[model samples]
Every structure is written in structure tokens, then in C-alpha cells.
Target: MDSISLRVALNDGNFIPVLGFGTTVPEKVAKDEVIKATKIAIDNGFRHFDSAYLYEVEEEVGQAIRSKIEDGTVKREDIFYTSKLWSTFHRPELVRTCLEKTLKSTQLDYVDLYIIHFPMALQPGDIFFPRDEHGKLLFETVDICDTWEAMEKCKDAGLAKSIGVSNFNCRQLERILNKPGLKYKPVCNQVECHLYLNQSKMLDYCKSKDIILVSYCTLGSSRDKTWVDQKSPVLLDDPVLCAIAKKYKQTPALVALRYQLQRGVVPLIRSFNAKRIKELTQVFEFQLASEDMKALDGLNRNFRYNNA
Candidate 1:
């Protein structure tokens, strides 16, 4: 809403702030830490907040927003909140139930954006990832398009302002795009993208469909050991990124994020420190040169950290 953020127009006719605050933290971090970080993020001009049912921190995130609202720092309409539907609720009948659970958890009437957490469906039950003693994940065979039909229902019912999918491959997206009687197209696709894993092909393909490519792990998500591979290369420490950051007198994290903006990708960044939260807003302050952009583009190794 303010000039502090760059707004990207979605196919659904709503605008998404180019930069978003991600709430996926390592399992060891206490819930209160998340609440504190979220409040700090809002104080530092972050308007888009990203959370997921799988994260299991929706209530804490809600509390953070409520605290801000109570203090009159920001109104509900000013913040753009996003939540994801877990794969366990991929069934047509269970979609809205999942969304309602998130709404109740966040104490919100509706989320600005709702996303299918993944393309695959798991057996519905209390267990998030049902597995046998052999340690193989149990899978459910349901058409994703049918699941999407239910997503359309969520939009029509005004439970969610917009709907999209995450961790979907190109063929998976084509499946939804090619669905007959398709009422709404996905406005965006959230994926694991960073300097090492640029997702160039996916970005081009999503752009062709007028779908905004939202990136997670933009700064390599080094702090989250559970979700990220411990041995994975550190993105902020990369020589190319560091050199570019030095050229612009910025942090490598900021350089990496600005690279995404210059390439038309929305980067979801997370930081618990107040200083870093305030620093994230600096991406909008400078522009990367075309040659510098190409240099960053050359660092794309197509390394994907989150295969799920």
C-alpha cells in the first residue's frame, strides 16, 4: 500500500508485495520467538507475512499481528497474510476444513492468499505424514484437479481472496491449467529459488502463464536445519554474491533478494533479528546493473534444496 514495498499484480487482479516475511523457523525455536520476530517484522515495514499449516506456528503469528493491531501500528487491511493447505487435506471435501482450521488458528476472517502445500496428497488422518514401520511415506491417489475444484470453492465462498499452489512442477501446473471447466487459474507458484538454484526454466514457464513465481529460501535458509540440508552451500557466502554486494555496499542477502526483484520473482525472506528485519527493506533502495544481473544469473547451478 505504501511506497516502501513493490507491488506485483496477480492474474486474480490483486497485488502481492514483492517482498514477504516468512515464518518457517527451525523446530527448536520456541513459539514465543516467532511471535516476537513477526512483531518486529511488522514494525520494520513488512506487510506480507507467509505461514503454513505445516509450520504449526499460525496461532503465534496471529498473536503477533493482533498485538500490532491493538497498538494501532497496522490495520488488518494493511497486512497481506498467506497460509498453505497441508497435503493431508488435499481431498476435495477436506480442503475448506483445512482452510477454516487455519482461519481459526490465526483469528482471521480470511487469508489474502491460500496455497496447496504440495502436488501430492497424503492419507487423511491425524498423522501429517503417515508412514509404515518400513519408513516409506503413504500416498493417496486423488486427482489434483479435483482438489483444485475445491480451492475454487474456497475463493467463491470468500474464505480466501486468492488461491495457488506450491512445490508444483511444470507438468503439474499444466495439469491444472489444462483442466476442463477451470474457473480460476493459479495466480502464483511458490518454489525453492536462490542464487544457486535459480529455477530459470520454471520462472520462464510461469511467466508465460502470467503466474508470479514466489521464491522461498532466497537467502539459502541456513538457520533451518530440519528443512535444509546441512551440507548445502551457503548462499550469502558465495564469492559472486559477496563481490556483487561489495560493489553496491550491501549485504549478500540483500543482493540475492534484489537479484530476484530485477528478474521479476517475489522473494520471501525471514530473519529473527531486529537489525536484519530492518535491513531487508533496503532491497528497494538500489538497482542492480544489467551486467551485474547477468553475472548473478550466471551463478544458477539449478541446485534445489527442498525436493518436496
Candidate 2:
């Protein structure tokens, strides 16, 4: 059950392992299957459990995490549980309420890390919470700096151990740094990264600025259902990635996950199958050579699933 481990220093000097178990269940998968998979994930040694408000399964996800804690399989403190406050909760006053609802629903005392979820402000006032006609938000954009200031407060209040941003761009981060009352710099930036869309520039910028880059879509949007574009080429279909998998006698999936970690980017992996959950942690057991790593990079065709 031993797997690759990564530790990154936070703004406060605390460290968190890079690898996390994500629960972005696909529409085809049953919710119960996700719960079962989480149990298997904990049994398999995944200490980092990642979830979000929009995923709409935190209650189930929390149940599985609590089950692991109650059995002494993993102490509540030993696990790093990261949750999100959904874009709709960006308003300063609503932030704590949003988290409280999740806390009540998820049955957790507090989250280890609670991120802002995305940089794009929901039209305003819970627009992301519900959809309007034309499939657009009813409100206008709000300030990310305003929301981030509140996230730092959650950290200060001991409700969250760490704070970070997701789906942000360089200019957005620049805005964060420029905010007047900014007290806490984001510890990590969670965005999409894969073999086909290796973000070297973004990765380097975050590293240089001391912000850890946490990767989403680690498996190339396989489990996503909402935002599929017809023109995108699948990463698993890339010949270079497939060739590397063949060269190393591993699956293309594993190679893609491994490539990210080896390059110093933390990739988020998801699965609701117990066997696959257990199997995925094995990515840490092996290493890719310099040339093999380069070969994987050669396959980058700028294929991205999330444009925002």
C-alpha cells in the first residue's frame, strides 16, 4: 500500500503531501460506488482526500472518510481532507455559511484545506448555486481578492489548516498579490495538467513565486461530464504517451500520472473502483528516467478540457 510521497511547504511553513484522492465521480458511476471506492482508497494508503461543493457528493465522501477515522484506520488528524466552497459562496458574509453547510452535511469538524474553487467569480450572490434561463448566472462578477481575504480569515480562525486557489491564471494571481489587505498568499494553485497539456510556464511561475501547483484533470477529464468539447483529442489516445507506456510496460494512465509528480507538480487522481484505487498508489513505486520524461513531454499538443 506504500506509494509515492510529496511534501510542499506552505506560506506558514507547514507541509502537505502532493498526491490526493479526488472524488469527481462521473455521471455513469453510481454514488454508492464512489463511497465504496473511498473506503478502498483509505485502506490502500491514500491520506489526502479531495472534494468540492460542486461535486455534490461531499456527504458520501465525508462518510467514507469518517468511517476510516472511526476505525483507527486513519486518525482524523492524520488525513489531509481538502474541500471547496463553490464559486457561489464568494460573498464575504456567505463564505462561512457555505462552509458550515458542508461541515454539517459532510459530518466533519473542519477541513484540512478549503480552497476558493475557481478564480472566476460566480456572477454574484450564489449564481453558481443555481442556474438561470439562458444557462447563465443572474449576477455580475465579484472580486477574487475579496473572497481570498475571507479564506485567509478561515485559516486565522483555525477553521482551515491551509488556503489556496483553483483554476486561476497568472494575471489573476498577480491581482491577489496586489490586493491591499492581503494577509495570506495562496499555498497552492489547483489547475488542469496532463501529458497533452503540460503547463511548464505556469508551473515554473508558481514554483518561483513559492506557490505549489496542484494539478487537476490528472487523468485527462475522463470523469468529467459537464464541459466536454467535441474538438479535443484525448490524452490517452496520444501516440507518444501510449508508446511510453509500452516502453515501460505500464498503462498510459499510470505513465501520465507519474510524469506529473516526477516533474514536481502534484497531480490529483480519482477513482471509485477499489482495485483501481489501490492500484493507482503504485505510481510512486517507480520512476521515469530523464529521457522517458522528456519523451512524454514531447506529446504535448496543448489539449485542454477547461478553458476557464
Candidate 3:
């Protein structure tokens, strides 16, 4: 089968693949596993790959891409690689430093999409997540609007192809949009979305602004124990999704992924297993009926796995 051809338009006159392979996982998943999985994902026809400095696997991810390029699998321009600026480096001055670190680690000159990983800012330090003596999370007061200005510079300097934000609520997004000298509005908002937490309201808000909605935890992200609550219900096991999968002769994972694609949300997939990686690239093979799409829409319970 030909690879998935669907692409979503961003406000910045750029296109993002509807399906992207994500590399963030629990802390315990070794770096080697990430490299192996990324290679498998590329081999299976995934052009979009997402990574973050906080994931601590950019080097491995970069190595995987280089190997694929060396073997004539893909050119650097053909890959839509994405990286994020971690909260610890949220200061406006440190934004480029973070992006440069990612570029060096990934062995790339520029990234396709560079996003602010989260709306919040943490205390600046070498530590990824800073904490106080009481073990509470330490936060820094820095306006993300200021941070956006720095991100714009990256795009201007040819360090990043596009700039965006993640985990931003409606109000937070407006803060940047209404800035006095806004140069570039965020092209997309990356958030945790799935059949349960469909983000209908957020979707409408972003759609009104012509900003693409990118989804993480698209398969419920149960495997990433640190961020996901173990007691939460499994998304792939939902009876409605399973029923829809049975009708299409596909897995519930594909059903959930297809739901996002048909709704214009770019869903990110993180699978270390080779077989599962190949299976995820098959979302474009069939189409979901309108009624089935409506049924899946009804499955929304506003369940958000990642609290932040």
C-alpha cells in the first residue's frame, strides 16, 4: 500500500502529516529502544517524527535518522522532524540555546516544527524538573508571550521551519495571540487527545483561528506510566471503538487513529514494537463511514490522561 498521503495545512502556509511517529516514553525505556523503534517507523513509511529534549533520546533519534539517510532510505528534507523546548529552558534568552542543543543532538541543521513543550515555566537549571526542599515543583514566572518572540527569531534565523506551542489552554493561547507586536501566531497546539478526550471545544477554538490541533497520547498512552494514571480506563478497549474496529476489520488502535485523522487532528503514535509500528502506518487504507464517525464522536467523555 502507498504510504498515508493525508496532510493538514497550518496557518503559517506549511503542511504537517496527519500521522506522526512520536518518541517520548517512560524514563525506563532505554535509548537503544527508541533508536530501534524510530528506524522501524521510518522504514514503515512514517515521514513525521516527534521528539523532545526532555525525552533525553534526541541523540539516538538523530542517529537513527542518519543511518536511514546513509542507506538511501530518505533525505533530510523528506522528514518532518519536530522537537520541543522544555519547561526548564522557558526563558526567552535560552530558547535558541535549547533549539541549538536539539539540532546538535539530532545532527540536523533545522527542525520542521519547534514547539514550546508546555505553557508553564520551571526554575532554570541543568535539571530537567526542578523541585523545592519540600519536594514540590518549583515554577518560574515568565510570560510565554515573551518566549514566543524568541521562537519567532529562531524561524527568522532559519533555525526552525515553524514554531508552535503545546499544552496551552484557550486563555494561554490568547495571551500570545493578543500580544502587542505579534509576528507569527502559533501554527498548531499539541495536546493529549483521544476518543475519550476528543477536545471538541478546543478543536473548534483552534479551527476558528486556523491553527492545527496535534494530538499526543492518541492511543491513551497507558504504557508511559510516569505521566499516565494507571487506574484510568484503557482507550483501545472501549466497546464503541472495538465495535467500530470490528466493522472495519481493523484494530481498535487504528480506529482511534483514523478517528483523529478524519477529524483533522494530527495524531502522534509511539510504539517500540516493529509490528505495531508497521500497523500504525496503515490508517489511510480505509475510510470511516459518516455514521461511525458520529458514533466515535459520541464516545467522547472528556477524559484527559495527561493532567498537565
Candidate 4:
């Protein structure tokens, strides 16, 4: 089967396209670029789109979807849109409010998938990071289950068709799963997964629990420098990975993306370049042999690039 067109059934009975396009851009990139990039991705058969309130590009993503639907390129139901709930809005009373703001920002009736952006929480405010005068994160105390209750309410109210989380550990996921009167379990968990930081254990846990593990940074860190360290090694620059790419006549980027698909983990490829966006769709064209897949597995260092 073509992995590009593959859709995994979520616990909630909704299907998500195996491949997704991430819409977060660095501060230097214009927000308007998202509209163009999203449309390009749609043209290239990217049906799943990932974005966040923290990224502030949901409005532009909406613009792209509206234009495509207007021109008969695709229908709204044909696309699977995902947005995250920022830590600034993790408070129980603020959960639905934040989703409402996201709906207003995107001008959409409902989000296909809404997730908690992080396992951590910050002071209830407008700041994305919410640093104190001492430059430390202004952390707050709120039982995660409490915040999840509101998320359940959002699902019950039909504001979010499905609700899940991002960057959450297995223990945290268990909390929600074991919550009293848990109305809906998380359908997916989005996290940073790639060659260097292959999350084998996490993948197993999510699978056992019937949760889809969606990966971000499949190519490695964006090396935005603002988040990634200046000294971190690039996944595409690794000699082992490049060698495999050469052996298969594929780019290192495609190798990285295909590796995740083979492992049953969905990946979101982030790119604004039209050429690169089209190139990402070619991941379905080739399959890695079992020996090569094991060779890629041997490269795991459990190193993370987005540690910041």
C-alpha cells in the first residue's frame, strides 16, 4: 500500500492521513507564507495538517483551506486539521476558551484534532513561554486531569471532534486514561521522534494502549537556533543515514520519514519550500528492506534536539 495515502484509524473512530504537513514557521518566516505552503501541500496530496496556537499561523492555515475548498481542490471534510492547546491556556476554565479562540482564529467550525501542546503548564496568561523576571518559566500547579476534564467538555460540546495531547509522557497519559469518569481517551500523542531519538519504548506503550503515536521533527530539529542548540548534530548530515539514502537512491529526508511509517508511527513533515513539499510526497515511492530497517534502528542514540 502507498504509505502516503494511508490513514490510521484513531480510537475515536476517525482516520488520520499517515503523512502530515506541519505549519509552524520560525518567527523570521512570514505568517502569509503558511497560506501558500498549506495550499502547496494540499496540491501535493498532504491531507493532514499540524499547527498550534503557539505558532500563531492557524489563521493563515484557514485561509489556505478556504481557498482550496472554494476552487474545488478539496473539501473541508477531506482534510484532517490539528491544533494544540498552549500551556498559557491549560487552566480548566481556559481550555474551552482557548479552543474557541483557535476556532475564531481559523474561522473553522471545529478542529479535527485538538491536543495539549505540552505536559507542562505555565501561568495563565497570554505569553507563550511566560518567563518570570528571573528568566525562569512561570510554572503553575494544576492537576492535569482537571484540565483534561475541560477538554472532555470541549469534545462533549462538539467544539473539538477529537482531543489528545502532545509531548506527554506515558505516566501522564496513564493519568488521563485512569481519570474518574473518563469520557474520552486520547486518540493520539504527538511528540518529537526521529532517527537519533527513536522512541521505541514510547511507541510500544502507545500501541499497547491503542493510542496513535504521531511524530514531529521527523527530519531532526529545524535548527531554528532559538530552540535547538547551535552544536546539535543534524540527522540528514549523519554518515550512516546518508549511506542508506545513497544505497536506496533516495534522499536522507525520505529515509527518515519512511522509517517512521514502517514503525507504525505517523510523521508530520514541516516545510515551506514548494519543491521540498512536493518531494516529501515521494516517501511512499520506496520501501526499506528489513536489513536496512534494522541498520537504521542500530543508529538510535536516544538523543533529543528539541530539549529546550
User: Relative to the true structure, how large is the alpha-carbon lDDT of every model?
Assistant: 0.83, 0.76, 0.82, 0.82
lDDT of 4 by residue, 1-308 (tens): 22445787898888888988887644454535668777778887778888888877888888788788888988888888999888878877778888888999888778999998876888887568877866789889877888888787888898888988788888898988898898888888998898988888898799888888899888884546456545657778899899999898876988998898888888988877677777677888888898998999888788777775
Query: 192-276, model 1: which lDDT tens digit per residue?
Result: 8888888889987998998888889888877655556456577788888889898999779888888887788888987777777
Q: Candidate 3: give the clashing pairs.
A: none
Q: In model 1, which regions exceed 4 Å deviation? A: 1-5, 27-32, 227-232
lDDT of 2: 0.76
> Which segments of model 3 are wrong by more than 4 Å?
1-4, 26-31, 227-232
Q: Write the per-residue lDDT of candidate 3 for residues 1-308, one digit (tens) a residue.
A: 11246676777888887788887654354545677778788887788888899877789888898888888999887889889998988888778989989998888768999998887788888878777756767998887888999899889889999999888889988888889898878987888888888889898898887778888888876664565545657778888888889899877988888888888888898888777777776787878888888999898778676775
lDDT winner: 1
lDDT of 2 by residue, 1-308 (tens): 12246566667687777687787646464645577777877787778888888776788888988888788898876778888877767767668877777788888888888887875556444345455666855544667888888888888988878888887778888788778978878878888888777888898798877777888887775645567767557677677878877787776778878888888877788777666665567787777888887777787777677775
Residue 259 of model 1, lDDT score: 84
True lDDT of residue 166, candidate 1: 86
Better of 1 and 2 by TM-score: 1
In candidate 4, what residue range of length 10 has the lowest lDDT sum?
24-33
Cα RMSDs of all predictions? Answer: 2.4, 2.9, 2.7, 2.1
What overall lDDT, based on C-alpha atoms, would model 3 receive against the true structure? 0.82
Q: Give the TM-scores of the predictions, in the order they appear.
A: 0.94, 0.91, 0.93, 0.94
Q: Rank the candidates by TM-score, best first.
A: 4, 1, 3, 2
